[PDB]
């Protein structure tokens, strides 16, 4: 799934609503979805995915 890339440093709270890390990640690299993740800090982080799923 290199089609994949995580977020740094991006507010966890906004997460919140997958409809909001999916948008900013867009927004902000311009990918197709980029959905929150849970990593090893359990944070919430968006992973720009640059494919169809």
Do not use: M
């Not at 867009?26 to 800090?41: I, N, P, T, V, W």
């Amino acid at each position: 799934d290199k089609c994949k890339k995580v977020y740094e440093n991006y507010p966890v709270s906004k997460c919140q609503l997958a409809n909001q890390c999916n948008y900013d990640c867009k927004l902000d690299k311009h990918a197709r979805s980029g959905e929150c993740f849970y990593d090893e800090k359990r944070n919430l982080q968006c992973i720009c995915d640059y494919c169809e799923y």
